[PDB]
Design a protein around this ligand. Structure first.
Ligand SMILES: [Cl-]
Length: 443
């Protein structure tokens, strides 16, 4: 009917708290658990039995009784204390896990049992409500006002600034459309600033092509399956082609580097530094594609629509492996792990390192002919690009802070960048310190 989505929205609005209030509540329940002096809580176990319970697809009363049973089994006073304190290895609360899984019935049951809505849970919910599952549940479309990249997101996703806006919007988690637009803009800005860098001319052209073809609105592509056909035809034409790839609530990186114009061979470069990847495999993996024809338009359309179609991480990765002939990667670039973020910037950005490695391998005539100097030059070129992005964003943040010196979000963003990146380049530290002091001298 109409009752389930409306009740869900009302409950999630009523259960909304600031991060500090939820931390204080968790500390309170920790104090109560310590005063009781019983068995210590096991979060991993609790999440195991939570997934096992959700798989049973039980109704309200059965679900509530088993929820409290499994919460007592894992060393929690009640279901409520478990829902408020438990956290899996990825850092998700149970409500956050259920929302990212687009399991809206389970998330509603969690709110019935006292799960609360911090900024992260609200952000993950907002990402999940742009999905086919959110529409079948009865939710309305997201309001268009929310398509624009929030300033805290715009600066934190690029500069790695963990903070929350005064309106409660966290720096983490974002839709594919504005963040991929930002990535396209950044690669094209680096290309225009270094027009003699052929690698980045090619990379900027590929990014622009797939940004225009995918036609993302929020986190759903609006040209399927035409965008899949365009990208597949570009791949079989022998051109560099980026592939926007996602699963339920998570974004990765995917691209194809051809051996040359009109070639049929090349490389499939996949990147995941966050959810779904093991700690040892965090980063970029390069598959050798000796026939690009298994990269079909249907495959590309599935990749772009992974989140909105409700596809899981394993279905997406299986399709990627099958497109690579189910052979193992020939090379792995280790890149640092990211948690509690759908990696709309991290994965697509770090994918460029693999792109450059494949371009260098093509330059020297193959991966087996890559020398140490080649790979070290590749990594310093990638680090040059990332430093260009970082300097541009720091200057943009300083300029915006001066042109709006009383804004709480900009001031807090600058302070938090200074405070969480003390070993940054001292000229950017100076830029933002001078921005901060000029912003107070409008007393
Ligand atoms: Cl999965």
């Amino acid at each position: 009917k109409l009752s389930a989505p409306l009740d869900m929205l009302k409950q999630m609005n009523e259960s909304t708290m600031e991060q500090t209030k939820l931390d204080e509540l968790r500390k309170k329940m920790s104090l109560q658990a310590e005063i009781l002096n019983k068995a210590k809580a096991d979060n991993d176990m609790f999440f195991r039995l939570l997934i096992e319970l959700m798989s049973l697809k039980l109704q309200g009363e059965l679900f509530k009784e088993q929820l409290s049973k499994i919460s007592k089994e894992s060393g929690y006073d009640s279901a409520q204390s478990a829902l408020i304190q438990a956290t899996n290895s990825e850092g998700q609360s149970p409500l956050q896990y259920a929302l990212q899984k687009q399991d809206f019935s389970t998330a509603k049951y969690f709110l019935d049992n006292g799960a609360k809505a911090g900024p992260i849970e609200k952000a993950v919910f907002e990402i999940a409500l742009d999905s086919k599952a959110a529409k079948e549940f009865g939710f309305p479309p997201l309001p268009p006002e929310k398509e624009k990249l929030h300033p805290v997101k715009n600066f934190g996703l690029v500069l790695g600034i963990k903070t929350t806006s005064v309106d409660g919007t966290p720096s983490q988690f974002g839709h594919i459309a504005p963040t991929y637009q930002l990535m396209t803009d950044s690669v094209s800005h680096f290309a225009k600033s270094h027009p003699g860098n052929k690698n980045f001319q090619e990379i900027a052209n590929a990014f622009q092509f797939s940004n225009e073809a995918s036609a993302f609105k929020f986190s759903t592509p609006q040209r399927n399956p035409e965008a899949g056909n365009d990208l597949a035809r570009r791949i079989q034409g022998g051109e560099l082609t980026t592939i926007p790839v996602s699963c339920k609530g998570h974004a990765m990186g995917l691209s194809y580097v051809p051996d040359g114009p009109g070639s049929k061979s090349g490389y499939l470069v996949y990147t995941n530094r966050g959810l779904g990847a093991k700690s040892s495999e965090h980063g970029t993996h390069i598959f050798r594609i000796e026939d690009s024809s298994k990269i079909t338009p249907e495959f590309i359309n599935n990749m772009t629509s992974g989140h909105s179609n409700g596809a899981s991480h394993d279905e997406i990765m299986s399709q990627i492996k099958a497109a690579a002939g189910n052979k193992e990667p020939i090379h792995h670039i280790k890149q640092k792990g990211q948690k509690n973020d759908n990696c709309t910037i991290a994965n697509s950005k770090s994918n460029i390192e693999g792109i450059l490695l494949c371009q260098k391998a093509r330059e020297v005539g193959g991966f087996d002919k890559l020398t140490e100097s080649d790979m070290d030059s590749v990594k310093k070129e990638y680090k040059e690009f990332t430093k260009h992005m970082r300097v541009e964003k720091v200057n943009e943040l300083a300029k915006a802070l001066k042109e709006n010196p009383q804004d709480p979000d900009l001031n807090n963003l600058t302070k938090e960048y200074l405070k969480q990146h003390p070993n940054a380049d001292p000229k950017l530290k100076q830029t933002l310190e001078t921005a901060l002091k000029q912003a107070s001298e409008s007393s």
